[PDB]
Design a protein around this ligand. Structure first.
Ligand SMILES: [Mg+2]
Ligand SMILES: [Mg+2]
Ligand SMILES: [Mg+2]
Ligand SMILES: [Mg+2]
Ligand SMILES: [Mg+2]
Ligand SMILES: [Mg+2]
Ligand SMILES: [Mg+2]
Ligand SMILES: [Mg+2]
Ligand SMILES: [Mg+2]
Ligand SMILES: [Mg+2]
Ligand SMILES: [Mg+2]
Ligand SMILES: [Mg+2]
Ligand SMILES: [Mg+2]
Ligand SMILES: [Mg+2]
Ligand SMILES: [Mg+2]
Ligand SMILES: [Mg+2]
Ligand SMILES: [Mg+2]
Ligand SMILES: [Mg+2]
Ligand SMILES: [Mg+2]
Ligand SMILES: [Mg+2]
Ligand SMILES: [Mg+2]
Ligand SMILES: [Mg+2]
Ligand SMILES: [Mg+2]
Ligand SMILES: [Mg+2]
Ligand SMILES: [Mg+2]
Ligand SMILES: [Mg+2]
Ligand SMILES: [Mg+2]
Ligand SMILES: [Mg+2]
Ligand SMILES: [Mg+2]
Ligand SMILES: [Mg+2]
Ligand SMILES: [Mg+2]
Ligand SMILES: [Mg+2]
Ligand SMILES: [Mg+2]
Ligand SMILES: [Mg+2]
Lengths: 187, 233, 216
RNA sequence: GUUAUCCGGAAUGAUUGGGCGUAAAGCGUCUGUAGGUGGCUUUUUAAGUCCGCCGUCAAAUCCCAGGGCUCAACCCUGGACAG
RNA sequence: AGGUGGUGCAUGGCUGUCGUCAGCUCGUGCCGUAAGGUGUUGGGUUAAGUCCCGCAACGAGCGCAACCCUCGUGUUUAGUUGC
C-alpha cells in the first residue's frame, strides 16, 4: 500500500479542476449542433420579470445518427450549450436505405403533434416543415416526405419525428422476426 | 464452469417463500409456483437458472476486470453486505443511500475529495489544535461522510456492474442504473416488478438466511472470478 | 442598496494607504493639493506618450511618500515596455516636469517604477483592458468573457465584474454583471482589490466596477 | 406591381381525414314504427364481388412515343392506362 | 472659448427606501410534453435559509454570524508636560 496523499492527489490530478481548465472539446465528438428555436420564457417574482432563454437544438453527424435536446439559461450561449449536452445523452439512430431514405411509410404521435413520414425517390430532396425537416436533415436522410399534422409546436414535432424513425423496421429484421427469407417478402 | 446449487440447500436456507397474497404483484405470475396459508411460494427451478446465469455473467465480468457494487439498505442485509464486499474485495452500500451516487458523478466525486482531505486530517492529528465547535463540526462531516461514502471510497470512475438486495426499497439504485447503462443483478420477492433489473433473481425479502445463501453464492462467483482476473491481466 | 468601496472598508487592517506622508493640520491642505497636482501630471504624460505609440499602458497606482528632504513617487505599473523603451526614459522625462510642478525649495523628487508581476491580477489594468475593447465596439459579452479568462489564467481566486450604462448603444440603459468563483465583500479579513473606471462612448458614458478577491 | 374571381394551404364540413367528462358539442328519461347493421353449421342461387373476351364512352385537350416549323410555344401521326 | 441653458425617461458616480428585513440564486442530477418544480419543502430550534434530524437530491455562491473600531476586568512594559 502506497501513501494515501499521493494516490488521492493522483485521483485529484486525474480529475481536473473546472476553474483552471477552459472548454472546447466538442468538435472532437464528430457532431454538429443546429439551433432550432430560441424563445424567451419568463418566471415572475415580486421584483419583476425574470427572463430566461429556452433553446431547442438537434445534433447530428448527417451520417445516420441524430438527437434532440432542450435547454434553459440566462444567456443564449449557455442554453445552446446545455441543449447540446442534453441532446448528446439522448441520442439514437435512424434506419436508412441504400439510397438514403426511409424503409417505409410511418406515422407518429407525441402530445398533440402527429407526424407523417414517407420514403421518396432519389433526387426529390427533403421536403418538410421546420422541426421535422431539421431533425431529418441532421440525421442525414436525403430523400423524405413529411408533414406534421395536428399541432405546430417545434419541440413536440421533433420528439414525434424521433418516435417515428425509431419504430422504423429495416427489412433484414422483419425477415429475422417473421422467420422468412428476404426474397420471399420482396415479392 | 459450474457453481454450487441444489434443490436441497435452497430448501435449507428458506428461499422458496415470500410475502402474503394481498401484497403480491401479478406481474410476477408467470414464474411463481404455489400459494400456501396466504403466503406465496416462488419457483425454485427458475431461481436456479437465474442464479446460474447471474453467477456466470458475474464471473465473466469479474474476469474481464470490471468493478462491482453491492447494495442493500436494510438492518440485517447491511451487516451481511459489509462482509460480502470485504470477502469479494468490492464496493458496497449498506448505510443510507444517497440519491445521485451514480447519475450525478461530478458532485459525488468532489464530496469524495473533501472526505479524503478529512481522512488525512483525522490521522494527521491536526484536529487537536482547533476550538471545540470546529472539532465537533469536522466530526459531523466525518460521521456523515463515513455513513454514505464508506464502501465506495476506494472507487474512482463509473462502476459498470451493480448488485442489489430487494428492489422494492432500493428504487433509486434501479432508476440510476437504468439511466446510465449499467446491469442490475437483483433479488425479487412476490411484491416487486421484474422490469427494473437486467437479471432479476427470484428470492426472499424478510429472511436473513436467503440473503446470506444467494449473496454467498454470488460473492463466491465474484471470488473465483477475482482469481481469474488476478491471472488474466 | 449601496455597498461601501471595499477599499475604504478595510483601511488600516488589510489595506495600506497610498499617500504615506504626514503633515501638521495647516499644511495638510497644501500637501494634499500637491499630491493631486503630481498625480495629475504623471497620469497625463503617460496617457499622451504611450497612446501615441499604440499600446495598452497599465498604470496600477501611484504611491507617494513625502520625506522632509526627498519626495518619492512609486508607480505600480503593469507593462512599462512603453515607458522604459522610449529614448527619454519615463524616469527623467517625468522627473523634470513633476519637479517643475510641486516646487524645488527644500524638496527634490525621486521617481521609481515598479513592475507588478501579474497584470491581470489587478482590477485597474483589467478594466482599462475592457475599456479598450468596448471602445472598439466589441460586444460586452465577448469583452466580459475574455477578461474572465485572462484573469483566471493570471492567478485569481475570485472576481466580480460589473458594467453599467447604455450597452451596445441601445436607448434604455442597464446593468450587466458577472460573478466568478468566491467573492465575500463583507469579510474584512479578505484581501480585496476594487477599481472604478469610466469610459466615453459615442453613446455616452459607461461605468465599470471590478472586484478581485486574492484570499485571506 | 395593386385590386377582383376561384382552388390550395384548411385535417377549417374530416370517405381517405376531426370531434362531443371540463375547450363549440350526448336529446331530461324510456317504449317503439319506418330505416340501418346482425351469432354459428351445411346446401342452393349468382344480385353485388372477382377474372377473361366483345361493343361503345366522337374528334380536339391531358398522358407516352416519334415527326415538322432554325428552338420553344404551337401543329401532325400512332398508341394507351384509368374509370 | 464660456453656459448654475434643456433633457435624471439618453447616462456614469453617489445616495435614499422597503430593511440590518432574512432572504436571493446558481452548478450537476432527477420529476414534468412544456412554462416550471425539487434543492430552499416536512419535524424541531434560533436574532437569523441559525443550526440539527428526515427527505431525489448533492454541493456551492452572495447574504446572517465571524474577522474591524470604541467602552467594560486583568497582566507585561514605558514614565513627561500626566501622576
Ligand atoms: Mg390525438
Ligand atoms: Mg398544417
Ligand atoms: Mg443591489
Ligand atoms: Mg400581373
Ligand atoms: Mg378541404
Ligand atoms: Mg368552419
Ligand atoms: Mg376539432
Ligand atoms: Mg364553461
Ligand atoms: Mg361545454
Ligand atoms: Mg344523459
Ligand atoms: Mg346537456
Ligand atoms: Mg325534448
Ligand atoms: Mg328501444
Ligand atoms: Mg324492425
Ligand atoms: Mg339482413
Ligand atoms: Mg355471418
Ligand atoms: Mg377523345
Ligand atoms: Mg413530345
Ligand atoms: Mg424539333
Ligand atoms: Mg391524338
Ligand atoms: Mg373500359
Ligand atoms: Mg462647450
Ligand atoms: Mg423621474
Ligand atoms: Mg435546474
Ligand atoms: Mg424531460
Ligand atoms: Mg434539504
Ligand atoms: Mg425562497
Ligand atoms: Mg423554487
Ligand atoms: Mg413546493
Ligand atoms: Mg416546531
Ligand atoms: Mg435580523
Ligand atoms: Mg422534499
Ligand atoms: Mg448561512
Ligand atoms: Mg481605555
Amino acid at each position: 500500500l502506497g501513501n494515501d496523499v499521493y494516490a488521492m492527489d493522483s485521483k485529484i490530478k486525474k480529475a481536473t479542476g473546472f476553474g483552471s481548465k477552459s472548454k472546447k472539446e466538442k468538435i472532437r465528438d464528430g457532431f454538429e449542433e443546429n439551433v432550432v428555436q430560441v424563445r424567451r420564457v419568463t418566471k415572475v417574482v415580486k421584483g419583476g420579470k425574470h427572463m430566461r432563454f429556452r433553446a431547442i437544438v438537434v445534433v447530428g453527424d448527417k451520417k445516420g445518427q441524430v438527437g434532440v435536446g432542450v435547454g434553459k439559461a440566462k444567456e443564449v450561449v449557455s442554453a445552446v450549450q446545455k441543449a447540446a449536452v442534453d441532446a448528446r445523452r439522448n441520442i439514437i439512430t435512424v434506419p436508412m436505405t441504400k439510397y438514403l431514405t426511409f424503409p417505409h411509410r410511418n406515422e407518429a404521435d407525441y402530445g398533440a403533434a402527429r407526424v407523417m413520414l414517407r420514403p421518396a425517390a432519389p433526387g426529390t430532396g427533403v421536403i418538410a416543415g421546420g422541426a421535422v425537416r431539421t431533425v431529418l436533415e441532421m440525421a442525414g436522410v436525403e430523400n423524405a416526405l413529411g408533414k406534421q399534422l395536428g399541432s405546430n409546436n417545434a419541440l413536440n414535432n421533433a420528439r414525434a419525428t424521433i418516435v417515428a424513425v425509431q419504430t422504423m423496421r429495416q427489412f433484414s429484421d422483419v425477415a429475422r422476426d417473421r422467420g422468412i427469407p428476404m426474397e420471399e417478402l420482396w415479392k | 464452469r459450474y457453481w454450487n446449487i441444489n434443490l436441497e440447500e435452497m430448501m435449507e436456507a428458506g428461499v422458496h417463500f415470500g410475502h402474503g397474497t394481498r401484497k403480491w404483484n401479478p406481474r410476477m405470475s408467470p414464474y411463481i409456483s404455489a400459494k400456501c396459508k396466504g403466503i406465496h411460494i416462488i419457483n425454485l427451478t427458475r431461481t436456479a437458472r437465474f442464479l446460474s446465469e447471474a453467477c456466470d455473467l458475474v464471473f465473466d465480468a469479474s474476469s474481464r476486470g470490471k468493478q462491482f457494487l453491492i447494495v442493500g439498505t436494510k438492518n440485517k442485509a447491511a451487516d451481511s453486505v459489509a462482509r460480502a464486499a470485504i470477502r469479494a474485495r468490492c464496493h458496497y452500500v449498506n448505510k443510507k443511500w444517497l440519491g445521485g451516487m451514480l447519475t450525478n458523478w461530478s458532485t459525488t466525486e468532489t464530496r469524495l475529495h473533501k472526505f479524503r482531505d478529512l481522512r488525512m486530517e483525522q490521522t494527521a492529528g491536526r484536529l487537536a489544535r482547533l476550538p471545540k465547535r470546529d472539532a465537533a463540526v469536522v466530526k459531523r462531516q466525518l460521521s456523515h461522510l463515513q455513513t454514505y461514502l464508506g464502501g465506495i471510497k476506494y472507487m474512482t470512475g463509473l462502476p459498470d456492474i451493480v448488485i442489489i438486495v430487494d428492489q422494492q426499497e432500493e428504487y433509486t439504485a434501479l432508476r440510476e442504473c437504468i439511466t446510465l447503462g449499467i446491469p442490475t443483478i437483483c433479488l425479487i420477492d412476490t411484491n416487486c416488478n421484474p422490469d427494473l433489473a437486467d437479471i432479476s433473481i427470484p428470492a426472499n425479502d424478510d429472511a436473513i438466511a436467503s440473503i446470506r445463501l444467494i449473496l454467498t453464492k454470488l460473492v463466491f462467483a465474484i471470488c473465483e472470478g477475482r482469481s481469474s482476473y488476478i491471472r488474466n491481466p | 442598496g449601496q455597498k461601501i468601496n471595499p477599499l475604504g472598508f478595510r483601511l488600516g487592517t488589510t489595506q495600506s494607504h497610498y499617500s504615506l506622508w504626514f503633515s501638521q493640520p495647516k499644511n495638510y491642505a497644501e500637501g494634499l493639493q500637491e499630491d493631486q497636482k503630481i498625480r495629475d501630471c504623471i497620469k497625463n504624460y503617460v496617457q499622451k506618450n504611450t497612446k501615441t505609440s499604440s499600446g495598452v499602458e497599465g498604470i496600477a497606482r501611484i504611491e507617494i511618500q513625502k520625506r522632509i528632504d526627498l519626495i518619492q513617487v512609486i508607480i505600480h505599473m503593469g507593462f512599462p515596455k512603453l515607458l522604459i523603451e522610449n529614448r527619454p526614459q519615463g524616469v527623467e522625462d517625468l522627473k523634470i516636469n513633476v519637479q517643475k510642478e510641486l516646487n524645488c525649495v527644500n524638496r527634490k523628487l525621486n521617481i521609481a517604477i515598479t513592475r507588478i508581476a501579474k497584470p491581470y491580477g489587478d482590477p485597474n489594468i483589467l478594466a482599462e483592458f475592457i475599456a479598450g475593447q468596448l471602445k472598439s465596439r466589441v460586444s460586452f459579452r465577448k469583452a466580459m468573457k475574455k477578461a474572465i479568462e485572462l484573469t483566471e489564467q493570471a492567478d485569481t481566486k475570485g472576481i466580480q465584474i460589473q458594467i453599467a450604462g447604455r450597452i451596445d448603444g441601445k436607448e434604455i440603459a442597464r446593468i450587466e454583471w458577472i460573478r466568478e468563483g468566491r467573492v465575500p465583500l463583507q469579510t474584512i479579513r479578505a484581501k480585496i482589490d476594487y477599481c472604478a473606471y469610466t469610459v466615453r462612448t459615442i453613446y455616452g458614458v459607461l461605468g465599470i466596477k471590478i472586484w478581485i478577491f486574492m484570499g485571506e
